[PDB]
Every structure is written in structure tokens, then in C-alpha cells.
Amino acid sequence: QDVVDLDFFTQEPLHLVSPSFLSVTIDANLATDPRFLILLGSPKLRTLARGLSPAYLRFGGTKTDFLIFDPKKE
Amino acid sequence: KFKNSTYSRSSVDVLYTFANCSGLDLIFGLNALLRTADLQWNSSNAQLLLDYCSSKGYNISWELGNEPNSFLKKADIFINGSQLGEDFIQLHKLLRKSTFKNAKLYGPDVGQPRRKTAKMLKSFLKAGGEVIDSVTWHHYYLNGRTATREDFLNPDVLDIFISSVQKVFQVVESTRPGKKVWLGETSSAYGGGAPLLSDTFAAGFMWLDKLGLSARMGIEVVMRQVFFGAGNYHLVDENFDPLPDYWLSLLFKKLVGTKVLMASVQGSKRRKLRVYLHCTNTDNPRYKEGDLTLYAINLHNVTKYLRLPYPFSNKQVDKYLLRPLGPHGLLSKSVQLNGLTLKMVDDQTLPPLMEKPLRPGSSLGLPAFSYSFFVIRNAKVAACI
Ligand SMILES: O=C(O)[C@H]1O[C@@H](O[C@H]2[C@H](O)[C@@H](NS(=O)(=O)O)[C@@H](O[C@H]3[C@H](O)[C@@H](O)[C@H](Oc4ccc([N+](=O)[O-])cc4)O[C@@H]3C(=O)O)O[C@@H]2CO)[C@H](O)[C@@H](O)[C@@H]1O
Numbered sequence: 001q002d003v004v005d006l007d008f009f010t011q012e013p014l015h016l017v018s019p020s021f022l023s024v025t026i027d028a029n030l031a032t033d034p035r036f037l038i039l040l041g042s043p044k045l046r047t048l049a050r051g052l053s054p055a056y057l058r059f060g061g062t063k064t065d066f067l068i069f070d071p072k073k074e
Numbered sequence: 075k076f077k078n079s080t081y082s083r084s085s086v087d088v089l090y091t092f093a094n095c096s097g098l099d100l101i102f103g104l105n106a107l108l109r110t111a112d113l114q115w116n117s118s119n120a121q122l123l124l125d126y127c128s129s130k131g132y133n134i135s136w137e138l139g140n141e142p143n144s145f146l147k148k149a150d151i152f153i154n155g156s157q158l159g160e161d162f163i164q165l166h167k168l169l170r171k172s173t174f175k176n177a178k179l180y181g182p183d184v185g186q187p188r189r190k191t192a193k194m195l196k197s198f199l200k201a202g203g204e205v206i207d208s209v210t211w212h213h214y215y216l217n218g219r220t221a222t223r224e225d226f227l228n229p230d231v232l233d234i235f236i237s238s239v240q241k242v243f244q245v246v247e248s249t250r251p252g253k254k255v256w257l258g259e260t261s262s263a264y265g266g267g268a269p270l271l272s273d274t275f276a277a278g279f280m281w282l283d284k285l286g287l288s289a290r291m292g293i294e295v296v297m298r299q300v301f302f303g304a305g306n307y308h309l310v311d312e313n314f315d316p317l318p319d320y321w322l323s324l325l326f327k328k329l330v331g332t333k334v335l336m337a338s339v340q341g342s343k344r345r346k347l348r349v350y351l352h353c354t355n356t357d358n359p360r361y362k363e364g365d366l367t368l369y370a371i372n373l374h375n376v377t378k379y380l381r382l383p384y385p386f387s388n389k390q391v392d393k394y395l396l397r398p399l400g401p402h403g404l405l406s407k408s409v410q411l412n413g414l415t416l417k418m419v420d421d422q423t424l425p426p427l428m429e430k431p432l433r434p435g436s437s438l439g440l441p442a443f444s445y446s447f448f449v450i451r452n453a454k455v456a457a458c459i
């Protein structure tokens with residue numbers, strides 16, 4: 001048959017995840033895209049990101065170790 | 075191949091305002107390959123960025139380096155885990171002297187724990203483990219260039235994740251017992267993702283299973299590569315359209331709570347019917363304290379019917395079944411929730427996520443090659459209050 005019995009353990013939490021358990025990244029690579037300001041200014045994209053709040057947004061990736069802050073570049 | 079690039083105050087502002095306006099907590103990866111004469115980390119660029127972020131009152135968390143296990147291949151520079159821990163101790167001193175004294179520090183963002191990576195992680199946690207808030211590591215199942223449709227549906231590929239998690243916890247328990255462990259960057263396939271796979275309904279089996287296993291096995295936070303970007307593994311494409319994994323992520327967020335429980339299928343054989351159980355998310359207005367959220371993956375090519383155990387057999391269950399919108403089947407970029415296509419109402423409004431109430435006592439139907447959430451109403455589980 002295609003009928004399957006489940007067993008559940010419900011006596012106590014086995015772990016506690018963060019409220020931000022499901023988090024997301026933006027790849028460091030995207031900061032080198034000329035349209036970086038257009039892209040992340042998008043009100044549609046902010047609406048989508050708000051849906052996954054609360055969450056961490058990690059900015060990183062291979063390019064992390066090939067990016068230098070320049071306070072003059074404006 | 076990788077060349078140095080610069081980023082401006084403008085870029086930092088774009089990124090922070092995106093996160094602040096979105097209710098997201100920004101973690102910023104600092105450059106670890108800026109080295110003094112004797113391969114010490116040179117903190118001078120990071121000092122310029124900390125001061126600028128402080129001067130704007132930006133509440134930012136930090137990391138230092140990405141996949142240091144690969145720095146030899148990427149930059150012909152070898153930094154051992156000892157030296158990296160020392161570099162983290164120096165970043166910790168800079169944060170403690172900054173305007174945000176309690177700012178958090180995560181690392182070391184190692185790749186999945188092969189022998190040399192596990193050795194680097196151990197020596198890192200011996201040296202610098204006292205100053206990190208959580209241990210970060212990365213996981214991808216497949217190379218995007220060679221991955222097949224079959225790979226995305228194969229329980230033997232899904233199961234490899236279990237041995238990576240166990241190996242990371244073996245290193246952490248041997249060095250910094252109790253330290254939280256995060257997946258700092260994860261997805262289906264590296265090399266930018268598998269074309270026509272990593273951005274489709276088919277990608278959801280790996281994503282939901284990874285969330286289910288990570289939660290069950292003790293991982294506190296999972297960071298999805300990527301929310302937005304060039305790679306096929308994006309949640310949102312460059313035309314700002316959400317992909318199936320976005321809608322799966324949104325449902326997970328709304329329904330799945332912080333308290334992790336366990337489900338298993340009788341007759342064992344945990345291969346193609348994968349089941350996970352948490353308390354329901356207390357922020358979901360629809361549900362109440364004590365409710366359960368079951369989520370399940372069916373990788374069989376036939377429908378399976380799940381029977382809930384006593385004392386949950388006769389409870390009202392709300393079904394949230396995701397199926398692709400045709401004609402592209404599992405390779406579709408569109409998804410239906412209980413037969414309704416998921417689409418934004420407009421640029422400012424996510425749709426409501428409408429449940430299907432099942433007949434109480436009915437078995438939970440899970441079609442072939444599908445995944446579903448099930449909320450058990452009035453479950454009255456004391457663990458979940
Ligand atoms: O021209 C192109 O577009 C080239 O794409 C490359 O893939 C990119 C990704 O597109 C990019 N991600 S993004 O789209 O969101 O910007 C970025 O992804 C990396 C990530 O930065 C890094 O941390 C990660 O590193 C590893 C290392 C090892 C393993 N492993 O299990 O062995 C996994 C992951 O890898 C991500 C990834 O590969 O997706 O950068 C990559 C690489 O530049 C393709 O590599 C090129 O073929 C395209 O020409």
C-alpha cells in the first residue's frame with residue numbers, strides 16, 4: 001500500500017533554532033555590478049526581503065577577500 | 075583569477091539601507107588576505123570601515139575571511155587556523171574599542187569538513203574560539219556545472235549533508251563545547267548553481283531537506299546562497315521575480331517555529347519520505363500555542379498517504395501543499411499553493427498564503443515529487459507552550 005504511519009516525539013524540544021533560523025546571503029560579487037544601487041534600491045526586492053524577516057543578511061563570498069574599502073571613491 | 079576591487083561609502087550605504095528597510099540584520103565579511111610582512115592580518119582597512127560604520131550608527135555584525143581553507147589556491151597564500159584565530163582576536167579588540175562594543179563576530183566560514191578543512195577548523199577554534207559568537211561553515215551538495223535533474227531528486231545526495239554536520243559537531247565538541255554552529259553560506263550547487271535546476275521547483279527538495287536536517291541536528295542558523303544575484307540559486311531573479319524556493323522559504327518562515335521536535339516513518343527506511351516536526355511559529359496569527367507544524371518531502375514517483383499518530387489522529391489539519399505550475403513540471407519557475415499560483419499582488423504586497431483545511435481523521439496526501447507543510451491545530455503540545 002501507499003499508507004505510512006508517522007511516529008512523533010513531542011515530550012520536549014530537542015533543539016531551539018534562532019527566530020532567524022532561515023537567513024540569506026548577498027554575494028560580495030554583487031557589489032562589483034555597476035547597477036548595485038539600482039538593484040538593492042528596488043522597492044519590489046525590499047518587499048520580498050521583508051517577507052523573510054526576521055533574518056540575517058550575510059554579505060560575503062569568495063570576493064570577500066578581494067574587496068578593499070576606499071573612503072575617497074564616494 | 076580573482077583581482078582586488080574597491081567599494082565606496084555609497085555601496086556600504088546601499089547594503090545597510092537595504093537590510094535596515096527590509097528588517098534584516100547585516101553581517102559584513104571583512105578581507106582576511108590583507109597581510110603584514112610576517113603574514114599577520116593587517117587591520118588598517120577594516121579600521122577605516124569600522125570607524126565609517128560607527129560614524130553612521132550602523133549596527134553591523136562581522137566575519138573575517140571566506141573559505142580560508144582555499145586561500146592557497148585563490149591567492150597562493152597559506153594562513154593556518156592558529157594564525158586565523160589570532161587575526162579574529164585582533165578584530166575582537168577593534169570591535170570592543172568601537173562604538174558598538176558588543177557587536178557580534180562570526181567565523182571562520184570554512185568549507186565542508188574534509189580532513190584539511192577539519193584540521194584548520196580545530197586549530198582555529200583552539201586559538202580564536204573564545205571571541206566568536208557562532209562557528210560558521212559552508213555546504214553545497216553538487217558542482218552546478220555537472221549536476222543532473224536526478225541528483226536534485228536523489229536521497230543518496232540529500233543524505234551526504236548528515237555526515238558533514240556530524241563532522242563539524244565532532245570538531246566543535248572537541249574544542250569549544252556548546253558553541254553555536256551556523257551554516258554561513260549554503261545552497262544546492264556551487265559554480266553559480268545548476269542551470270535550469272537551482273532556480274526551479276526541483277531545487278526545493280534540497281532546500282527544505284537541508285532546513286529540516288539542520289534544525290534536527292542542532293544547527294541554529296542557515297544562510298541561503300543567495301537572496302538575489304547572478305547565480306541560478308537565487309531566491310529572486312534579476313527581473314525581481316521570486317522563484318519557487320522564495321515561496322517555500324516564505325511558507326517555512328510563517329509556519330515553522332523555533333522548537334524542534336522529531337517525526338519518523340514506521341518500518342524505518344528513511345529514504346524517499348522525509349519528515350520533520352517543529353512547534354508552529356507563535357507569530358502566525360492563525361494558530362495558537364501548542365500547535366505542531368509537520369513538513370514532508372515525497373521523492374517517490376507515487377502519492378503517499380501519511381497517518382498521524384495518537385493523540386493527533388482526529389485533529390483539524392491545515393495543508394500547505396506546493397506543486398509546480400505547468401508545463402515545465404519539476405523544472406518550472408512557478409509554484410502553486412493548494413492549486414493557487416503564488417504571485418505578488420503588486421510591488422508592495424505579498425499574497426496571502428491560503429491553507430486547505432482537511433477533513434479531521436483523514437490521512438495526509440503527499441503527491442509524487444512534492445513537499446507540503448501540515449499544521450495540526452489544537453495539538454495542545456505542552457512542549458510548544
Ligand atoms: O560569469 C559568471 O557568472 C560565473 O559564475 C560563477 O559562479 C559565481 C557565482 O555566480 C557567485 N554567486 S552570486 O551569483 O550570488 O554572485 C559566487 O559564488 C560563490 C561564492 O562566492 C563562494 O563562497 C562559493 O565558494 C565555494 C567554494 C567551494 C565549494 N565546494 O563545495 O568545493 C563551494 C563553494 O562558491 C560560490 C559558487 O561557486 O556559486 O562566485 C561564483 C564563482 O565566481 C562561475 O564559477 C563561473 O563559471 C561563471 O563564469
Ligand SMILES: [Cl-]
Binds near residue numbers: 203204250253
Ligand atoms: Cl568558549
